[PDB]
């Protein structure tokens, strides 16, 4: 009977970086997804493996909400089978992903006039991430032939670069808050149900 805390996820004051993306378990509550799809706040609402209007009619188990902040033109990489820096080094979705990817512009919240540097992305990594794998290691990357031994130098960089989030930047360089919902469809005893 108790409502799912979707207001604690979407209306949170602070969102994580994409390399350290936060995952929240939604469980043992009634979920009303009709107030999310009919809300005009979300610019991107793409659902995979489920219709968005059928969400109220299903019961889900293992519901997870992954929240982070990425820049504007990289929202297209939060999808199965995409390539680039966010998909390969920061946040990878599986090819058999079922769930919904929700994103909206947050330029009025996550941009400071001098530049907001609290959001960082992993620019460099030795290998591609597995799906739903988090890498928070800050080991010094080797971009050249000479080994670094944990010390920066020529072709030795810190792997995390911060976004420069300013309000003057156009759409595409503007911050977008991305919440990814993930479900399992009718195979276990379900704790999250629509009304």
């Amino acid at each position, epitope marked *: 009977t108790n409502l799912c805390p979707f207001g604690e996820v979407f209306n949170a004051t602070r969102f994580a970086s994409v390399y350290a993306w936060n995952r929240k378990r939604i469980s043992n509550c009634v979920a009303d997804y009709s107030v999310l799809y009919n809300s005009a706040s979300f610019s991107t609402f793409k659902c995979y493996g489920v219709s968005p209007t059928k969400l109220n009619d299903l019961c889900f188990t293992n519901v997870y909400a992954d929240s982070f902040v990425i820049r504007g033109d990289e929202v297209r990489q939060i999808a199965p089978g995409q390539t680039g820096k966010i998909a390969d080094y920061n946040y990878k979705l599986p090819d058999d992903f079922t769930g919904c990817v929700i994103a909206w512009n947050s330029n009025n919240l996550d941009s400071k006039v001098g*530049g907001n*540097y609290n959001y*960082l992305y992993r*620019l460099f990594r030795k290998s591609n991430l597995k799906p739903f794998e988090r890498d928070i290691s800050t080991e010094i990357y080797q*971009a*050249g*032939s000479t080994p670094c031994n944990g*010390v*920066e*130098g*020529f*072709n030795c*960089y*810190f792997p995390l*670069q*911060s976004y*420069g989030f*300013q309000p003057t930047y156009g759409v595409g360089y503007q911050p977008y808050r991305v919440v990814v919902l993930s479900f399992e469809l009718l195979h276990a005893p379900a704790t999250v149900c629509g009304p």
Partner: nanobody
Amino acid sequence: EVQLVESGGGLVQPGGSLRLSCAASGFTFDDYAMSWVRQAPGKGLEWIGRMYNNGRTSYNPSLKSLVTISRDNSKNTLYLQMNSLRAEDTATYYCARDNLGYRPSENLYGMDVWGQGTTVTVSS
């Protein structure tokens, strides 16, 4: 035109302190990593340090105790504050931008644009 100019070098007594500048043209430091590199007369290029866009600094660990890298984004200058210049600091100091983007081939230094560099001499 992407251009780096350095200034502030010259004669300096041993044990003193001296500041350098890396006035930039054609771009700003808000989205680029900028580095200081030292060239000794008898040795190769020695990496001094690096400023990232968020303002964090990394230094040469054999040189950390006597250098300081600071920005002034209002005038797009990168500053390099030496302290206690000794005889092996007599060198030509270049300021160059790190290439964290596309590299067309293998680069020994990873620098897409260099400065002309300024000469600092420490003697009697």
